[PDB]
């Protein structure tokens, strides 16, 4: 049938025609992978994009978080009517919360509301938006902790990697007790990500999250960094310091965590690796230009490096 070749040729034409339109859209997008430890703030940052950049079981979910937090505090003490019973409400147990596991959102719920709750999801969590007619594609792989991370070879073409750490969690253990404090656990994950075979040409944007809790912890005399980190005793404030408006004690604490992450980056970084440290609060900070301004630097630096200039 002469017709049979003719029809097939006609069918290949429609398919090939669309793939021309889809190629232009695909090549003009930026993909940003999110990484972090457990209970860090990866989900909250994505929610900040959906609230301003683009565009109900929450009521039930909010109550569940409040119910779980109520029993956790009273249990450690030994070691319509239902809501009213817990309303009357042990305060000293909440003060020494570093000796056990407790959710950060316990105090606010018991005493930004929709984005303060915590929900655990196993499937990949995705989000698309535009800011200045330039397409952006932010997604978080998430899931339960995996120590093999065999899927990381798939993300070999992303524009940048966003890293989120909890800077107010230097005196709490992670999951099984007696393990290293959460800040040390984040450092070990950073070294594995930084010194990775596949991720040899990917930049890292470092977010030092949860700044507001850090300020109040140092202000109170509960715990001292010198106990957990002996090297903090000999630390001195760097000369190239530009603290916003802050006490000298709080400013010194902020940087010691930041420069401690940098020494890992600068050791093995000989070109094609850059780290951009930022001080951010996930819930409160209202500008998304930090990612936008940075993403214009990886591209230009990449072009500049290209052509041998730098």
């Amino acid at each position: 049938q002469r017709n049979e070749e003719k029809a097939q040729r006609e069918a290949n034409k429609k398919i090939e025609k669309q793939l021309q339109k889809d190629k232009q859209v695909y090549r003009a997008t930026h993909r940003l992978l999110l990484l972090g430890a457990g209970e860090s703030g990866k989900s909250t940052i994505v929610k900040q994009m959906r609230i301003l950049h683009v565009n109900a079981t929450k009521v039930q979910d909010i109550k569940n978080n409040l119910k779980e937090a109520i029993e956790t505090i009273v249990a450690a003490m030994s070691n319509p009517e239902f809501y009213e019973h817990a309303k009357a409400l042990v305060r000293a147990c909440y003060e020494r919360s570093n000796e056990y596991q407790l959710i950060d959102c316990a105090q606010y719920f018991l005493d930004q509301d929709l984005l303060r709750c915590r929900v655990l999801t196993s499937g990949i969590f995705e989000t698309k938006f535009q800011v200045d007619k330039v397409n952006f594609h932010m997604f978080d792989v998430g899931g339960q902790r995996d120590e093999r991370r065999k899927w990381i070879q798939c993300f070999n073409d992303v524009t940048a990697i966003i890293f989120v750490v909890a800077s107010s969690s230097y005196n709490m253990v992670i999951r099984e007790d007696n393990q290293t404090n959460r800040l040390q656990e984040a450092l070990n994950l950073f070294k594995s990500i930084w010194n990775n075979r596949w991720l040899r040409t990917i930049s890292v944007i470092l977010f030092l999250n949860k700044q507001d809790l850090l300020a109040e912890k140092v202000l109170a005399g509960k715990s001292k960094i010198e106990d957990y980190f002996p090297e903090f005793a000999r630390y001195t404030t760097p000369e190239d310091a530009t603290p916003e408006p802050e006490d000298p004690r709080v400013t010194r604490a902020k940087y010691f965590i930041r420069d401690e992450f940098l020494r890992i980056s600068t050791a093995s970084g000989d070109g094609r690796h850059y780290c951009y440290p930022h001080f951010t609060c996930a819930v409160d900070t209202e500008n998304i230009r930090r990612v936008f301004n940075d993403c214009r630097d990886i591209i230009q630096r990449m072009h500049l490096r290209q052509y041998e200039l730098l």
Binding site: Q8, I15, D22, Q144, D157
Partner: protein
């Protein structure tokens, strides 16, 4: 308590002693009189273009004329190998895909990936509009492979050290398999579709039973992860491709490893293995941008296919043994003959 662990060593020692008694003679000595195959050289016949990104999945059809490919740009294209003409291009709900399949009757195509869900599509339908038929969503962790026992049963191997035999009509797991301590990465059904294997990440492989749903044997000869597996055409042996440079051939009846394939210069990994029609040539992909051809009975390299500009991630042989298709990460397929 501790007594059970004490008896675990005794049983572990018992297995090794039994296998040592059955090692009458190595396979190398018995086949020393077979004439070598010689030099095998093939040239590219067709090249298929039209993918926007790297490719992980590929599977032929029963007629050995049509094949389906998958990529992380969000497309599932079906080709026509003879005349190089695309037939379909199904957009996907998720941009992360790690596997694909093709039904024996050609009426369905399967897919899955990091979205923890296996999807089934329909090709032969009224009005000629491909639409999602079912969505199998009971797992945790990513998927690795999908295989079609029939138009109603599909076998998946998720990343939570489990496997299951699904049922498209009801969308529920008929049976589930446990026993692996590491991520499952591949599987291959038997020619009679009565048994299948699975290469986990704990350097071990098992031989499950489809009906009874219980393990039968375990081979632990490797030293690293396992990325590929495939049965001998006879149905009583299979070959394994591990993360290290070695590939080994096991035997079900003798319950021992028979041969090992390695080369001093090769220090890369293996991502896909397959046999020939008569089970005489053992092709195998590699991370060093080419594909090698081994010998099943001699362990002698007999050719190299190095026409690719990126790593090889999939490979397959037609049902009539006439062509070999090898995908790669540069969005280009090739047909060798």
């Amino acid at each position: 308590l501790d007594q059970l662990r004490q008896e675990a060593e005794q049983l572990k020692n018992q297995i090794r002693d039994a296998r040592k008694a059955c090692a009458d003679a190595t396979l190398s000595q018995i086949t020393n009189n077979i004439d070598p195959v010689g030099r095998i050289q093939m040239r590219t016949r067709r090249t298929l273009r039209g993918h926007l990104a790297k490719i992980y999945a590929m599977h032929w059809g029963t007629d050995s004329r049509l094949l389906v490919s998958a990529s992380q740009d969000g497309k599932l294209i079906i080709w026509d190998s003879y005349t190089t003409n695309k037939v379909h291009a199904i957009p996907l709900r998720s941009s992360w895909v790690m596997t694909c399949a093709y039904a024996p009757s050609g009426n369905y195509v399967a897919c899955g990936g990091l979205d923890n869900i296996c999807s089934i599509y329909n090709l032969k339908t009224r009005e000629g509009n491909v639409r999602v038929s079912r969505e199998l969503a009971g797992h945790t962790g990513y998927l690795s492979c999908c295989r079609f026992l029939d138009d109603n049963q599909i076998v998946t191997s998720s990343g939570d050290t489990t496997c299951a035999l699904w049922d498209i009509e009801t969308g529920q797991q008929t049976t589930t398999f446990t026993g692996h301590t590491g991520d499952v990465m591949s599987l291959s059904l038997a020619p009679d579709t009565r048994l299948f294997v699975s290469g986990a990440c704990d350097a071990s492989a098992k031989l499950w039973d489809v009906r009874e749903g219980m393990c039968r044997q375990t081979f632990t000869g490797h030293e690293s992860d396992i990325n590929a597996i495939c049965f001998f055409p006879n149905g009583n042996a299979f070959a394994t491709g591990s993360d290290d440079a070695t590939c080994r051939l096991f035997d079900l009846r003798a319950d021992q490893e028979l041969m090992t394939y390695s080369h001093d210069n090769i220090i890369c990994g293996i991502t896909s293995v397959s046999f020939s029609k008569s089970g005489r040539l053992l092709l195998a992909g590699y991370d060093d941008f080419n594909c090698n051809v081994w010998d099943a009975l001699k362990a002698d390299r007999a050719g190299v296919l190095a026409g690719h500009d990126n790593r090889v991630s999939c490979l397959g042989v037609t049902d009539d043994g006439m062509a070999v298709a090898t995908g790669s990460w540069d969005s280009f397929l090739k047909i060798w003959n």
